[PDB]
C-alpha cells in the first residue's frame, strides 16, 4: 500500500494541518463529557432514547445481487437504518487548532460513510445517527476543539469572522456558548434549546498554545501564506504551500488547453 504524504508541510502551520488530516496520528483527548451531556449538546437524541430510523434494517430491504456492494461493509448505523443527522461546527479565524477545509480533509480520512459541506462560517457533517455520535467524540473532546474558538451551532452561525468578545470567546448570536468562572460552558444545546444543566467544556487554551497548534496562516502574527517579496520569486524562495498552488494552476491551465502539454511536467 502506497503511504500518503497528505499535503506539503514545511512549517509549524502546515505540519499542524498534516497531523489533523493523517488518520494514523492520534488526536489527544483534552476533556471528558458524560454520555448525557454529550448527547444533550448534539441535541438529536437524549440518553436512553431509542434511535429513530429512516428506512428498515439493511437486512430487510432486499439489497440486489451486486458484487461490488459486497466489498464495502456497511456501518452500524447503515445496518440499523438510522436517520442521517447533521452536526455543525464553526472555527474562528483567530488561531483555531482546526479550520474549515482541514475538517473536510480530516473527515474524509478518519470517518466512514460521510456527507460534509465546507462554508466560510460553518462545516457540516452528516452521517447515520449512531455513526455521527461516535465521530462527535473526536470533534468535541480532542485537541481539535478549543472550547472558545471551535463551537457547535446548528443555525444562526455568524461569528467565525467577528471580533472576539472581552473574554476571547467567539461570538454566538444565540449565546449557546458562554464563559462562566473561567470555563467555557454550553448553557443551551447546539439548536439553541434549553438544557437541564450546562455542559462544562473546561478552560480555553492559552494564546501561546493556540498560536503553537493553529492550522491557519495569519499576517498579523508575522506568518502569512505569502510573505512580502514572495510574489514572483522563484519556487525555492517561497512557502511550499505557494509552490504547490503555483503548480496546480500551471497544470490545470496547460492540461485543460491540451492534456499532453503537462506530460513530464
Amino acid at each position: 500500500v502506497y503511504q500518503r504524504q497528505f499535503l506539503p508541510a514545511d512549517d509549524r502551520v502546515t505540519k499542524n494541518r498534516k497531523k489533523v488530516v493523517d488518520p494514523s496520528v492520534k488526536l489527544e483527548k483534552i476533556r471528558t463529557l458524560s454520555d448525557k451531556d454529550f448527547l444533550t449538546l448534539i441535541g438529536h437524541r437524549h440518553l436512553g432514547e431509542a434511535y429513530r430510523s429512516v428506512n428498515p434494517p439493511l437486512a430487510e430491504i432486499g439489497e440486489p445481487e451486486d458484487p461490488i456492494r459486497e466489498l464495502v461493509p456497511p456501518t452500524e448505523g447503515a445496518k440499523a437504518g438510522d436517520r442521517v443527522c447533521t452536526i455543525i461546527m464553526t472555527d474562528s479565524v483567530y488561531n483555531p487548532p482546526i479550520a474549515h477545509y482541514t475538517r473536510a480533509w480530516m473527515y474524509h480520512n478518519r470517518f466512514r460513510g460521510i456527507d460534509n459541506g465546507v462554508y466560510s462560517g460553518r462545516v457540516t457533517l452528516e452521517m447515520r445517527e449512531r455513526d455521527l455520535e461516535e465521530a462527535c467524540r473526536t470533534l468535541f473532546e480532542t485537541e481539535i476543539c478549543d472550547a472558545s474558538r471551535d463551537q457547535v451551532r446548528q443555525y444562526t452561525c455568524t461569528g467565525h469572522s467577528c471580533r472576539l468578545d472581552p473574554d476571547g470567546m467567539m461570538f454566538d448570536p444565540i449565546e449557546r456558548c458562554i464563559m462562566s468562572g473561567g470555563n467555557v460552558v454550553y448553557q443551551k444545546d447546539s439548536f439553541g434549546n434549553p438544557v437541564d444543566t450546562p455542559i462544562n467544556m473546561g478552560k480555553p487554551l492559552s494564546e501561546e498554545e493556540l498560536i503553537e497548534r493553529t492550522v491557519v496562516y495569519r499576517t498579523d502574527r508575522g506568518e502569512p501564506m505569502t510573505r512580502e517579496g514572495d510574489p514572483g520569486a522563484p519556487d525555492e524562495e517561497v512557502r511550499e504551500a505557494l509552490q504547490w498552488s503555483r503548480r496546480i494552476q500551471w497544470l490545470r491551465m496547460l492540461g485543460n488547453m491540451v492534456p499532453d502539454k503537462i506530460k513530464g511536467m
Binding site: 479550520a99 455568524t158 471580533r163 472581552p166 501564506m225 505569502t226 505557494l242
Partner: protein, 591 residues
C-alpha cells in the same frame, strides 16, 4: 499614506472605524448590547409599518420577534456603509431625469444595508430597466427599401420628421388613424428615440434633440474610434416605456419599436396602409439589422431577447459610461485611470447580474442578498486593494497602465501580491474582517482586486480574469476557508477553462455571460469580470471593449439612470432621492 478604507483620499473619512466608533485594529467587541433591530432605523420603522399593515389586511407580515430561539437580529452591530470614492469625483454635476444635479465630491455615508437592497432601491431597478427597455437598429435597410421599392428620397429633413413622429408615437400617440386610443404622456415621459452617426455632416444637419452626439459625449480619441466603426451609417436608439417592460419583459422592446418605427416610416414617407414594404420595416427592426442588449436563453431559464441573463459581460462593460468621464481620463495623476472604470463598471455589473438576475429572476426572497454585493462598492476596501496592485505593477515593471507584458508569469506575480495585500489587511484589521463577515465577500474581493490589477496593467481581459481564478489556492491555503457552500464552482473550473477550447469551455470573456454554464448560478463573480473587461480595454487605449454601438447607445443624458457614475446613483437611491420612471401616479388615487 494610510489605506483608503481607513482614510478616504479627500474627505479623510475612516470608513471601517465609522461602523463601530472603535479602532478597527482592535480584536475586541461587546455583543448582545444593541437592542437587536432597535439599532436599525429602517428595521425599527419597518416593524411599526408592519403592525399597521397587519391591522389593515388581516394577515401578519414583518415580525422581528420570530427570529430563531429568541435571538432577534442585531446581536452584533448592524453596520452602516459609505459609498466608495464619491469624495474623489469632480464631474457629473448635471441635473438628470431622476434627480437634481449631484454636487461632485459629496460623500454618501451611514447608509443602512436595507437602503442598498435591490428591492428597496429604485436606482438599481431603473438601472436594469434602462438596459432592457433599449432597442438598437441600423436604419440603412429601411431607408434602402423606401428608396428602391417605394421610390422616395431619404434626406435629413425626412429623417427629422420620422424622429419627431417616432417620439410622438413611441410612448403616447397615434398619427395615421381616426378614433385610436393613446397612452397618458405622464406614464411614458421616459420613452423616446434618438440616433447617432459617424458622418459629422449628417449629424450637424439633424434636429439635435434626436441626436446622441458622439463628438460631445466622448473625448476626441474615443470619438474617433467609435465614429470609425459606425462609419457613414445611422443607428437608432429607442427606449420604450419603463412601465411597459414592468408589465412584461425586455423582449418587448424590439417588438414595440418594430410597431412604432414602422408606423413612423409609413407616416413620414406617405406609404399606403397595407403596402408590402411595411413588412420590411418590422423585419428590419426585429431581426434584419438589430443589436440586442441580451440574447435568448435555453428552456430551463427560457427568455426572449433582453433579459439580464442574455447580456454578454462585454455588453455590461460597454453600457457603463465611466470610460468617458474626466475621472477615468485624467484621474491617475493626469493620466487615464482604468481602475476607476473597473470599480464603477463592476457596480451595476454585480448588482444587476446578482440582485437583478440571479436573485430577482432565478431565486428570490426578501433580502436581495444585499450585504454580499454591498461589500464590492463601499468603504474603499476593494478600491484600496485594486489600486495597490496597479501602483505595485507600475513601480515593478516601470511602465504605465496596459503596458505590462501579458505573460502568464506576470499575471501570477501580480495576483500573488494583491492576494497577499488583501489577506494582510483582513488579518491586521479585525474590524474589517467583521465588516466583510462572509467569506465570499473577502474571497471575491481579493480575486476581483487581483483581476483588476492584471487587467488594468496588461490590457488583456482573459488574462485579467485568469488572475481571478488563480486566487482560489492563494485564498484557500491561507485561511482554510473560502466562501459560501457553492461559491468556487466557477473558480475551480476556470483555473482550467480560461484557456481551454473545448465546446462549452472556450469563449472570450467579452462574450461570456450569465448563460456560460460555469457562471449561470452563483453570486459574487460576473460583475467583477465585467469591470475587468472594461478596464483592460480602457488601459490599452480603447473606447470600448466589445461593441462600439452599445457604448455609443448608452451615452445619453436622457437615460433615467446615470450610467457614468453608478456607485453614486445607487447611493442616491439609498437616500430615497432617485425618482425612477414607470410609476403609475397619474392614473391612481392620491397617496
Amino acid at each position: 499614506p494610510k489605506q483608503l478604507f481607513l482614510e478616504s483620499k479627500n474627505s479623510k473619512m475612516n470608513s471601517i472605524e465609522m461602523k463601530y466608533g472603535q479602532d478597527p485594529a482592535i480584536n475586541r467587541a461587546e455583543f448582545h448590547v444593541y437592542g437587536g433591530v432597535r439599532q436599525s432605523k429602517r428595521k425599527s420603522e419597518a416593524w411599526e409599518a408592519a403592525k399597521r399593515i397587519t391591522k389593515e389586511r388581516g394577515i401578519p407580515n414583518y415580525n422581528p420577534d420570530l427570529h430563531l430561539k429568541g435571538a432577534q437580529m442585531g446581536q452584533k452591530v448592524l453596520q452602516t456603509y459609505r459609498i466608495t470614492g464619491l469624495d474623489r469625483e469632480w464631474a457629473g454635476g448635471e441635473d438628470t431625469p431622476a434627480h437634481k444635479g449631484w454636487k461632485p465630491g459629496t460623500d454618501i455615508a451611514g447608509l443602512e444595508m436595507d437602503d442598498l437592497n435591490y428591492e428597496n432601491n429604485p436606482a438599481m431597478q431603473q438601472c436594469y430597466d434602462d438596459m432592457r427597455r433599449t432597442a438598437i437598429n441600423g436604419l440603412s435597410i429601411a431607408h434602402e427599401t423606401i428608396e428602391r421599392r417605394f421610390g422616395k428620397e431619404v434626406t435629413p429633413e425626412t429623417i427629422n420628421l420620422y424622429f419627431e413622429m417616432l417620439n410622438h408615437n413611441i410612448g403616447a400617440g397615434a398619427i395615421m388613424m381616426e378614433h385610436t386610443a393613446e397612452t397618458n404622456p405622464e406614464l411614458v415621459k421616459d420613452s423616446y428615440a434618438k440616433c447617432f452617426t459617424g458622418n459629422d455632416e449628417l449629424a450637424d444637419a439633424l434636429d439635435q434633440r434626436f441626436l446622441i452626439d458622439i463628438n460631445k459625449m466622448f473625448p476626441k480619441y474615443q470619438a474617433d474610434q467609435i465614429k470609425a466603426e459606425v462609419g457613414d451609417r445611422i443607428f437608432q436608439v429607442a427606449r420604450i416605456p419603463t412601465m411597459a417592460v414592468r408589465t412584461s419583459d425586455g423582449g418587448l422592446s424590439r417588438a414595440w419599436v418594430g410597431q412604432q418605427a414602422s408606423l413612423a416610416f409609413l407616416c413620414a414617407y406617405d406609404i399606403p396602409a397595407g403596402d408590402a414594404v411595411t413588412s420590411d420595416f418590422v423585419f428590419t427592426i426585429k431581426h434584419g439589422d438589430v443589436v440586442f442588449m441580451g440574447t435568448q436563453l435555453p428552456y430551463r431559464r427560457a427568455q426572449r431577447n433582453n433579459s439580464a441573463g442574455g447580456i454578454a459581460l462585454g455588453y455590461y462593460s460597454d453600457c457603463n459610461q465611466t470610460s468617458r468621464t474626466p475621472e477615468a481620463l485624467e484621474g491617475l495623476d493626469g493620466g487615464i485611470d482604468p481602475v476607476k472604470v473597473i470599480v464603477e463598471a463592476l457596480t451595476p455589473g454585480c448588482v444587476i447580474t446578482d440582485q437583478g438576475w440571479l436573485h430577482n429572476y432565478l431565486a428570490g426572497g426578501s433580502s436581495g442578498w444585499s450585504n454580499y454585493i454591498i461589500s464590492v462598492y463601499t468603504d474603499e476596501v476593494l478600491e484600496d486593494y485594486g489600486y495597490h496592485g496597479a501602483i505595485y505593477a507600475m513601480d515593478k515593471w516601470k511602465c504605465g497602465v496596459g503596458e505590462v507584458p501579458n505573460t502568464y508569469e506576470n499575471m501570477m506575480t501580480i495576483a500573488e501580491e494583491v492576494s497577499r495585500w488583501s489577506q494582510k489587511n483582513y488579518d491586521e484589521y479585525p474590524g474589517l474582517m467583521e465588516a466583510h463577515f462572509g467569506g465570499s465577500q473577502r474571497y471575491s474581493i481579493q480575486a476581483a482586486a487581483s483581476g483588476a490589477a492584471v487587467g488594468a496593467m496588461t490590457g488583456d481581459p482573459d488574462l485579467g480574469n485568469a488572475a481571478w481564478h488563480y486566487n482560489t489556492p492563494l485564498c484557500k491555503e491561507h485561511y482554510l476557508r473560502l466562501g459560501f457552500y457553492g461559491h468556487d464552482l466557477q473558480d475551480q473550473q476556470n483555473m482550467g477553462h480560461t484557456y481551454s477550447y473545448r465546446s462549452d469551455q472556450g469563449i472570450p470573456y467579452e462574450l461570456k455571460g450569465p448563460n456560460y454554464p460555469d457562471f449561470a448560478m452563483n453570486v459574487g463573480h460576473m460583475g467583477g469580470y465585467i469591470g475587468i473587461i472594461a478596464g483592460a480595454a480602457h488601459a490599452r487605449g480603447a473606447a470600448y471593449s466589445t461593441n462600439p454601438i452599445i457604448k455609443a447607445a448608452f451615452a445619453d443624458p436622457n437615460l433615467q439612470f446615470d450610467f457614468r457614475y453608478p456607485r453614486r446613483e445607487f447611493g442616491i437611491g439609498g437616500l430615497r432621492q432617485f425618482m425612477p420612471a414607470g410609476e403609475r401616479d397619474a392614473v391612481i388615487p392620491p397617496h
